[PDB]
Ligand binder design. Structure first.
Ligand SMILES: CC(=O)SCCNC(=O)CCNC(=O)[C@H](O)C(C)(C)COP(=O)(O)OP(=O)(O)OC[C@H]1O[C@@H](n2cnc3c(N)ncnc32)[C@H](O)[C@@H]1OP(=O)(O)O
Length: 177
């Protein structure tokens, strides 16, 4: 009968949603918060339409990491941001301009509120996945990273010298070494 509060939908600080997005049926709620966050992320960037949504997540083998700050809002919790990850099949150019058919884990979407940015939240999201997915920053690819994410990557994981591509993904020297 009574609509779930944020703490019932997402008990943990970091929540890992699947293709199966997971009193009433909670899915209509979970759906909304994913679509909202998707539009927010898509609007922060100058994107035509959202690249992240409840629908899209149901179609693909991606992982969505939700970070809920439990103290905010009287202790009901608030969603500060998310990080979406999945395996794309890519033809990347190595340092000699030869295409390499590979299928790395990629950062597909990544967003924190416009305010509350430049707090430890993005770094915590990233650090979580990395341990969960058991992977290094350098061995994974990045779908059209923004200036801020490139700043983020360089200062957190020393990722600096990007190997030239043309398919709007980004990999670093260490990706091949
Ligand atoms: C793969 C994709 O689709 S890209 C999607 C990413 N989204 C965007 O491009 C729009 C902007 N990005 C976002 O909205 C994301 O939620 C982010 C970037 C805010 C998440 O990162 P945050 O957690 O805010 O970064 P955080 O505050 O932890 O800062 C980490 C470090 O990166 C640097 N950094 C982060 N954001 C920025 C920025 N906008 N400008 C300059 N430097 C930045 C900082 O220097 C910081 O280190 P320092 O403060 O010690 O120097």
């Amino acid at each position: 009968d009574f609509p779930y509060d944020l703490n019932a939908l997402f008990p943990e600080r970091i929540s890992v949603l699947d293709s199966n997005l997971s009193r009433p049926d909670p899915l209509p709620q979970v759906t909304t918060v994913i679509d909202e966050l998707g539009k927010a992320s898509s609007k922060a960037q100058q994107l035509p339409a959202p690249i992240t949504s409840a629908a899209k997540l149901q179609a693909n083998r991606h992982h969505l990491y939700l970070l809920k700050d439990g103290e905010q809002n009287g202790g009901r919790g608030v969603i500060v941001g998310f990080l979406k990850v999945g395996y794309k099949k890519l033809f990347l150019l190595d340092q000699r301009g030869a295409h390499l058919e590979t299928e790395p884990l990629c950062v597909l979407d990544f967003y924190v509120t416009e305010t509350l940015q430049r707090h430890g939240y993005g770094s915590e999201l990233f650090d979580f996945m990395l341990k969960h997915k058991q992977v290094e920053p350098a061995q994974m690819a990045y779908d059209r990273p923004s200036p801020k994410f490139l700043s983020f990557l360089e200062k957190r994981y020393d990722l600096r010298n990007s190997v030239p591509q043309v398919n709007n993904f980004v990999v670093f020297a260490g990706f091949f070494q």
